[PDB]
Design a binder for these strands. Structure first.
Ligand SMILES: [Mg+2]
Ligand SMILES: [Mg+2]
Lengths: 177, 307
DNA sequence: TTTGGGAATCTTATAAGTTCTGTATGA
DNA sequence: CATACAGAACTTATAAGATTCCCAAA
């Protein structure tokens, strides 16, 4: 192995509160709620611990972002559910699911992106006129990696933490060799 | 049987090829790509702006395969298109048609871009002392662009600002006694070319690389050269560029974004003891709720917001 | 015309490096 | 009037839903 463990940077999870919600009531009676229905249809809510943001929809469906672990994401989503309950809605915690996981790390050596796009062409997209990183679409596991000249790597699209580790271990010999 | 929006698209492809004065074979290849593209549902049902940039995409793919140095920004300027809409449509159609599109040919772009610089004849805006030979210019610029590529200055950057910086340095170094007083902005203005925002940074990076190379030669190292005094030794430095670059890597030479001071942060430790199943106390939640007084002060404030 | 099937707009988070604003501080 | 620094766009994954938009069969 590389001896490099990719750090989780962001977790996106969803949950169904199982009841219809009046967003005007939430925006009025909560301190941590941002609601501009002409800009975006959902209530934007923030809690300080775990530091996260939620998108609360009138349907009762919720999106939770910013957590650094799957456990933190679940704890945060549960706290938003509890805020909705105390506002007077019969909120439940249904079908909690991790939707996306973002990892990041550093191989600590520079990458010839112009060479990698030639050798691993079938997985690589590198257009420096548009973005500095090479977009690597790994098929197994199904992970998108953003590879920079600095050797810093972004890994995204994972449903489970093991797919971030599996993708980085697969990419390390390609970058090293 | 061919659709109307398709006929209009194929006609637009041919007109763009003609306006760009592309060799005759390119038109047929680009038309074939648009037809191949239209067979997919997501393209057929594309919206007004994506349909317009699709024409440009098919012409650019064709150009890239033939090493025709058409940049994305140049095609977007011609089409009066949004670069981002062109960007997403290009990435989508390459993925869709399962093509391996060659990268932009830098050598071809140096030849084209460098030839557009109006410095080969004296005019009211170009004094005779600033006139340079076209072949000498192209040859030196190409060597400096190849040096930029070799010393990590090109990777992940916009390519045209590297050529702007290299052209200027080529021009200055061919007659240094009279051209070192002229700035990059003044050079672009007399050459009658726009100054790309990153050209200044590319210039300073290129001068820094030429100084590291100058340190590999004993007689240049003793001169304690700076970014201004190194300019007259560029001809010498480029003559031995392969040897000097090998020598500079042997003795640290990394992409400019790596040579940066380390960042100091206190949240580096990632240790957490969160299980996701811990108790959520009432006091923890009540801090996120407005009090009846806050609700009342807020309601009063929104009751006067209208008229 | 009606319905259906897509893809896009708005928003949230987060790493990464480059490009390019908009603003502000010492002359 | 220099330059210096902040902030944000670009790229990637991902969910939410009203609404628009563009083509298809019926
Ligand atoms: Mg960033
Ligand atoms: Mg969606």
């Amino acid at each position: 192995p590389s001896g490099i463990v990719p750090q989780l940077q962001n977790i996106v999870s969803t949950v169904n509160l199982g009841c219809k919600l009046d967003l005007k009531t939430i925006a009025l009676r909560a301190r941590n709620a941002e609601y501009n229905p002409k800009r975006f249809a959902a209530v934007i809510m923030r809690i300080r611990e775990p530091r996260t943001t939620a998108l609360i929809f009138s349907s009762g469906k919720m999106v939770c972002t910013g957590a650094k672990s799957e456990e933190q994401s679940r704890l945060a989503a549960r706290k938003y559910a509890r805020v909705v309950q105390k506002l007077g809605f019969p909120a439940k915690f249904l079908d909690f699911k991790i939707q996306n996981m973002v990892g990041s790390c550093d191989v600590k050596f520079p990458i010839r992106l112009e060479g990698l796009v030639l050798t691993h062409q079938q997985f690589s997209s590198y257009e420096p006129e548009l973005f500095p990183g090479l977009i690597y679409r790994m098929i197994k596991p199904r992970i998108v990696l953003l590879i920079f000249v600095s050797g810093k790597v972004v890994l995204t699209g994972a449903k489970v933490r093991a797919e971030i580790y599996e993708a980085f271990e697969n990419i390390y010999p390609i970058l090293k060799g | 049987q061919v659709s109307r929006s398709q006929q209009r698209g194929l006609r637009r492809v041919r007109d763009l090829c003609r306006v760009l004065q592309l060799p005759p074979t390119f038109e047929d290849t680009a038309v074939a790509y648009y037809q191949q593209a239209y067979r997919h549902s997501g393209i057929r049902a594309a919206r007004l702006q994506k349909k317009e940039v699709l024409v440009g995409c098919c012409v650019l793919i064709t150009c890239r395969q033939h090493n025709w140095p058409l940049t994305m920004g140049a095609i977007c300027t011609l089409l009066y298109a949004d670069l981002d809409v062109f960007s997403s449509t290009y990435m989508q159609i390459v993925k869709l048609l399962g093509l391996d599109v060659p990268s932009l040919c830098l050598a071809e772009l140096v030849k084209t871009y460098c030839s557009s610089f109006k410095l080969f004849q004296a005019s009211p805006s170009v004094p005779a002392k600033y006139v340079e030979d076209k072949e000498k210019m192209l040859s030196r610029t190409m060597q400096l662009v190849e040096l930029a590529n070799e010393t990590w200055l090109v990777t992940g950057r916009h390519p045209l600002p590297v050529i702007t910086a290299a052209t200027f340095l080529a021009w200055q170094s061919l007659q240094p006694a009279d051209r070192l007083s002229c700035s990059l902005a003044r050079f672009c203005k007399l050459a009658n070319v726009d100054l790309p925002y990153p050209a200044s940074s590319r210039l300073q990076e290129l001068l820094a690389v030429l100084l590291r190379m100058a340190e590999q030669l004993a007689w240049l190292r003793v001169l304690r050269l700076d970014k201004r005094s190194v300019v007259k030794h560029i001809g010498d430095l480029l003559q031995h560029r392969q040897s000097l670059v090998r020598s500079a890597f042997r003795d640290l030479l990394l992409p400019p974004c790596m040579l940066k001071s380390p960042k100091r942060i206190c949240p580096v430790p990632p240790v957490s003891t969160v299980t996701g199943d811990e108790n959520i106390s009432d006091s923890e939640i009540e801090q996120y709720l407005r009090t009846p007084q806050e609700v009342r002060d807020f309601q009063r404030a929104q009751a006067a917001r209208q008229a």
